[PDB]
Subunit: 473 residues, 3 copies
C-alpha cells in the first residue's frame, strides 16, 4: 500500500511536507471558497443556518478523519506489512483534503446544474459541431468521442479539470487521485459497472490521467485507496446533515421523524435487531428511542437529538467502514473493488440507506427545493443560450477574440465577460495542438469545454446574477 | 326545471331544498373565491376599491334578482297560464347563482387570457398533435373536431367543465343550464357553449331539462349581465380620475343621441322621465350632495335608470315567453332597437371610448397575453412527452425525465386526477392515443385558466427565474 | 453663399439672422434635445450622477464649434470678404452651434449598440418579412435591393435628418438641416435632400461647410470629457492619466515637439506638466483644475488647427468635396485628438460597467423589435386600418399599435397618402419598417428598458 508519491506535475518526512503544502493549497484555493455560496439542498437565500456545499464537506472531512484513525487502530501492527507504516498522517491528510474537494467540480443548483448542461448540449451540440467540422472531413472516432464527452458532464471530472488545468493548483498526483471516485472516461459510454458507471475524467485530462496512473502506480480503469474512504465518508454524512436542517426548517417534527425513521426502516431490516459495534448492545429502535428520550437538553431540544443520535449511530458506521477496508485490503490496493464500502446489505448498511430513504420522501420533494432545481435549470440553459454566439463563430474569429484582437462587436463583449483563467486555459490548450492535423475538432471541443467551465464554476448567486444582467430585466 | 344532479342516480319544497344546496356549493367553491383575485377592468394590484370579477358577479346577481321580482310582479296572476306556479325562489335562485358564476370560466386578464390560449394552440398545437397520433391512425373527423375544439376556448364552456368535472360540485342540471348562454359547440364552427369533453354532460342536461337551445335562465342572466356590464366600470373610471361627473353626463347624452333622441321619455318611468331629464336629475343630485358627489351620481342614476331596464328585460321575457320556453330566441332580451336598448348601448359606447382603451387596462391585457403564452411555453415539455411517459409522471411513478417530473409535481392534484379519471373512461379504447393527448391539452388549459392574476404572474415569474 | 433663409413651408442678411435665430428656438424647445438628457453618453446615467449625457456632450461640442467659428473669422480677417463669408460671423456661428447641439439626436440609446442592435435585427429577419409583403416576381428589383440596404443600414446622422424634418416637423431652414449631412440619409428623405441640395446649390454627394466645422467640434471634445468622468468615478488618477497621455501621445509624434497655436510655445509634455502642476497646487478641486488647465492650453491650438484647415481647403470645403476631416492630417494637433481617443479606448469605453450597459442595451433594443415584430407580419390592409384607428379583426397587434407614438403613426399615414402609386405595396412595408426604427431609436435609455420590462411582464 505504498502507492503514495510526492511528485507534482511541475524519506517519508519529505512526503509529509509536500502533503502539508497540498493542505494549504486546497484550503486557500478558490474551489473551496465557491462551496460556501453553493446551496446543498435548501436554497441559501431563504435559509439562515442551512448546510452549504462547504459545511457539508467539512462534516465529511471529519467523518473521513474518523474512519482513517479508527481504521489504523484496527490494523495495529499488521499495517506495516501492507505498507501503511508511517502513513497515518499521509493517509489522514489525503482522506481529509479529498473529502473537502469532493464537490468542487459539480455545478450550482444540485444535480439540475448537471442536467441543464448535458441537456443543452444534447439538444444543440450536434448542429453546432457540424458547422465547425463538416460531415465527412475530420477523424470520426475522435468526433464521436468528443461528442459524447461534452454531452456527459460530471462534477468529479470537472473537479480534476478545475484543480489541475483551471486553478493550476499543481497538487501531488496522490492528492488529486482522491477525486477519481469514478474511473470510466466520459468518451466511453455507460455500461465492471459500479466503478465505471459515471464519467471519471474528461478527454482534456486524458494526458494528465496517463501521467497520474503512471506516477502514482495504478492500472488504467482503476480507482485509488483514498477514494473508497471518501466515498464511504460522503455516504455516511450523505443526508444526516440534511435531515437535521429539515427538522429545524420545520418540515417534520423530531417525534414524527423517529417513527418515520422506523417505518421507512422496515424495508431494510427489523428495528429490534441488535446493531454491530455498540458496547451497550443498542438496537436501531432502542437507539432512536434513546435519542428521543435524551431530548426533552432544555436549550437545544432539536440539536441534542441529532447529537445523541450521532454518537450512538455514527460509531457503528465508521467502525463498519474500517472493517470493510481491511477485509478488502488486497482488492482496494489493486483498485478493483467494484462496490462502495458501505453497500453490502448488512444491518449497519441499512443505517446509510434509511437516511437516504427518509430524505427522498420528506426532504428533497419539498417545493422550496424543487423550485430551486427548476429555476437553476433555466439559469444554466439561458446562460448557455446567451453565450452560444461564441460557439457559432468560426475558429479564426474566436481565437482572435480570445487573444484580445479587435474583431464582431457583440461576441467580443461576451468574450470580455469570461474569466481570464478560462480564456487562457483555452489559449494554452490550443497552443499545444496548434500544429495537429485534427486541430479544428480540438478547437471547438476546447471552446465548448471553456464555456462549460464558466457555468459550473459559478456560485448560485453568481449564476443567477449573470443571467439577470444579460436578460436586462 | 328538474332537480336531478349528476351524482343523483335516482314537491316544490324538495326542489327548492336541493337548489339551496347549490347555493352553498357555489358560494363555498374555489371557483367563486378566485373571482375576488381576478381583475375586471382596472388591475387590482394598482387599484384598491375597484371592481373585480367577484364584485362584478355580485352586482349582476342582484340585477338578476330584481328581474325575477319584476318578472313575477309584471306577470302577476298570468303566471299560471305560462306554468310559473310556485317558482318564486327557484327562478330567483337559479338566476341569482347563474349570475354569480357567469364569469368563472374565463382566464385572467380580460379576454386576452382567452386570446392568448387560443392563439397559442392555433400556432403550435398542430405540430404537437401530429407527434401524438401519427398520420393514418385515428379518426380524422374526430381529429379535425378536436383541433378546433382545443383551438376554440370560451370561458362559458370552461365554466361548465370547472364546476362539473374539476370542482366536482355536482350541481343540479338546471343551475348549470344557466351557463349555456350561447348555443354552438366547439367542434362545429359564435362562442362555444360547451367543449367536446363535456358532450356527455350536455347530453344529460338537454334531456333532463331541444338540443342546441338556450335555457330560460340564461336570457335573464344575459339581461342581468348587460345591465351592469359597464355602468360599474364607469364609476371606477370617475374614481380613477379618467372622467368627471359633469363631463360624464355630456358623454352619456351625446352617445345616447346617436341611438335615440335624448328628450324622448323612457318607458317604465312613473314620472315619465327622459334620458336628459334623468341625467340632469342625477347630476343635479351631485353638487347638491356635499360629502360623496361621485357616489350620489351613480346611485341616483342607478335608481332612476335600473328600474326601467329591469322592467324592459322582464317584459321582453314574457313577450317572447313561448319562444324563450322553446329556447329558440336568437337575440338577447335587451337588444331590440328600443329606448332601453339605447341606454345599455350608451353605457357600453361610453365605456369603449374612455375605459377599456385606457393605457393601464391595455398594458394589463398585453401583459396577461405574454404571461399566459409563456406559461403554456413553460409547460409544453409535458405535451412533447409520449403518452406512456406522461402517465407515469401523473400517477406519481418515477419516470426517467427529471425536468418534466418537476413540471408535473407543480400541477394541481385536482387537474392531474381529473386527467387520470378521463383516461379511465377510455382505458382500452380503440382510439385512446387521440383522446389521451386531447385530455393532456385539456388539462393544461384548466391549469392556466384556473389561475388568478397574481398566481399566473407569480408562476410565470418563478419559472423564468427572474 | 451657401446660406439661404428658405424653410420647407441675394437676400436680406438680417432676415436670415432672424430666421436662424428662430431655428435656434425651435431646436432648444424641441423634444429631440430633451431626449439627449436621458440618453447616456458613456457611463450609465442610472448609476452615475454627474456624468455627461448626450445633451451635456452636445453642449460642449456646441461651444467648441462656436470657438472654431469665432477663431476662424479672426484668421480670415479682411480676406473673409473675398470668399463670400463677409458679414456671416453671427449666422455661421449660430448655424454651427445648433448643428453641434443636434449632432446626436438621431442615434439610439445605449451607445453604438443601439445602432448595432437594430441593424443586426434587420439583417437577420428582414428578408423573410419583406418577402411575405412582396412575393418573388412582383416589385422593382432595383428598388427592392435598395430598400433592403437602406433598412439594414441604420445610422444616427440619417435618422437625425428624418427626426427633425419628418417626425418632429420643426420646419427648420435647409441650412440648419444641412449640417447633419456628415456622411448619409434614408430613402425616405431622398426628395427632401434633393430640395435641400437645390435650394443651397449643392451637387449630389457633397458636404456642407457647417458639417466640416461641426465634425471638428465633435472631434475636439470627443473624449476629453469622457476621460474626466473616469477620474471622478475612480477609473484613473490625475497622475496616472498624465503619464498615460504622454506615453500614448508618443506613438503619433514626439511629446517635446512644440504645438502650433500656443503663444508660449508649449509642447505636449510641457502642457501636461503645466496642467499637473496647477493641480495639487490647487487646494479645493484638483480634478477640475487639471482638465481646466489642460483644456485652456490644449483646446486653443486644436480650434486654431480646424479653422486654419478650413481656410486651407476653403475651395474644397465650399465645393463640398474635401474627402478628409479638418482635424485628420497627421499633424501635431491631430496627434492630440488621437491621443485622447487612444487613452479612452484603453481605459474608458472598455470599462465593464460600460460594456454591461452596451450588452444590456443590445438586449433591450433587440427584444423591443421582437415584441413589435407582429406589426411587420401584418399585410398592408390590416395595418393601414390599425394606423387609422378603424376596428380591425386583429386583437394583439391593435394593442401593440396603440402603444406607438402618434407622431410616428401620423408620419406613416402622411407618407402613404403621398404614395395611388403602382408600387405602393413596396413602399408601404419599407415605411412600416421605418416607423418601427423611429419608435425604437427615439427612446431614452430608461424609456427603452421600461417598455421592454413591461412587455416581458416580469
Ligand atoms: Ni457530498
Ligand atoms: Ni359579466
Ligand atoms: Ni458626439
Amino acid at each position: 500500500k505504498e502507492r503514495i508519491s510526492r511528485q507534482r506535475p511541475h524519506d517519508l518526512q519529505d512526503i509529509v511536507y509536500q502533503l502539508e503544502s497540498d493542505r494549504g493549497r486546497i484550503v486557500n484555493s478558490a474551489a473551496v471558497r465557491r462551496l460556501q455560496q453553493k446551496t446543498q439542498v435548501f436554497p441559501l437565500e431563504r435559509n439562515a443556518a442551512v448546510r452549504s456545499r462547504l459545511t457539508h464537506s467539512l462534516e465529511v472531512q471529519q467523518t473521513g478523519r474518523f474512519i482513517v484513525r479508527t481504521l489504523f487502530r484496527q490494523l495495529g501492527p499488521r499495517a506495516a506489512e501492507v505498507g501503511l507504516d508511517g502513513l497515518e498522517g499521509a493517509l489522514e491528510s489525503l482522506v481529509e483534503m479529498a473529502c473537502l474537494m469532493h464537490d468542487v467540480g459539480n455545478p450550482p443548483f444540485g444535480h439540475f446544474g448537471e442536467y441543464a448542461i448535458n441537456d443543452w448540449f444534447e439538444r444543440n451540440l450536434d448542429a453546432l459541431f457540424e458547422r465547425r467540422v463538416p460531415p465527412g472531413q475530420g477523424d470520426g472516432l475522435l468526433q464521436q468521442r468528443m461528442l459524447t464527452d461534452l454531452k456527459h458532464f460530471e462534477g468529479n471530472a470537472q473537479a480534476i479539470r478545475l484543480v489541475v488545468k483551471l486553478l493550476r493548483l499543481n497538487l501531488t498526483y496522490t492528492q488529486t487521485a482522491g477525486l477519481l471516485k469514478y474511473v470510466r472516461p466520459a468518451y466511453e459510454p455507460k455500461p465492471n459497472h459500479y466503478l465505471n458507471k459515471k464519467p471519471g475524467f474528461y478527454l482534456s485530462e486524458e494526458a494528465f490521467v496517463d501521467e497520474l496512473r503512471q506516477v502514482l502506480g495504478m492500472r488504467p480503469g482503476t480507482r485509488h485507496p483514498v477514494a473508497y474512504i471518501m466515498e464511504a465518508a460522503d455516504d455516511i454524512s450523505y443526508c444526516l446533515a440534511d435531515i437535521e436542517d429539515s427538522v429545524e426548517k420545520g418540515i417534520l417534527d423530531i417525534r414524527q421523524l423517529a417513527d418515520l425513521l422506523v417505518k421507512k426502516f422496515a424495508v431494510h431490516h427489523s428495528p429490534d435487531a441488535p446493531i454491530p459495534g455498540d458496547a451497550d448492545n443498542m438496537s436501531f429502535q432502542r437507539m432512536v428511542d434513546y435519542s428521543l428520550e435524551k431530548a426533552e437538553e432544555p436549550i437545544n431540544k432539536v440539536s441534542e437529538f441529532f447529537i445523541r443520535l450521532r454518537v450512538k449511530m455514527i460509531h457503528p458506521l465508521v467502525q463498519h467502514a474500517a472493517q470493510q477496508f481491511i477485509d478488502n485490503l488486497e482488492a482496494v490496493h489493486a483498485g478493483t473493488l467494484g462496490r462502495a464500502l458501505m453497500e453490502d446489505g448488512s444491518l449497519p448498511h441499512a443505517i446509510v440507506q434509511t437516511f437516504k430513504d427518509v430524505a427522498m420522501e420528506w426532504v428533497f420533494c419539498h417545493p422550496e427545493v424543487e423550485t430551486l432545481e427548476l429555476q437553476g435549470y433555466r439559469i444554466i440553459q439561458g446562460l448557455l443560450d446567451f453565450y452560444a454566439p461564441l460557439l457559432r463563430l468560426p475558429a479564426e474569429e474566436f481565437q482572435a477574440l480570445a487573444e484580445g484582437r479587435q474583431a464582431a462587436p457583440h461576441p467580443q463583449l461576451l468574450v470580455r465577460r469570461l474569466p481570464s483563467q478560462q480564456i487562457k486555459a483555452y489559449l494554452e490548450a490550443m497552443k499545444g495542438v496548434a500544429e495537429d492535423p485534427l486541430q479544428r475538432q480540438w478547437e471547438f471541443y476546447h471552446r465548448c469545454r471553456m464555456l462549460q467551465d464558466f457555468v459550473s464554476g459559478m456560485t448560485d448567486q453568481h449564476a443567477q446574477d449573470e443571467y439577470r444582467a444579460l436578460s436586462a430585466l
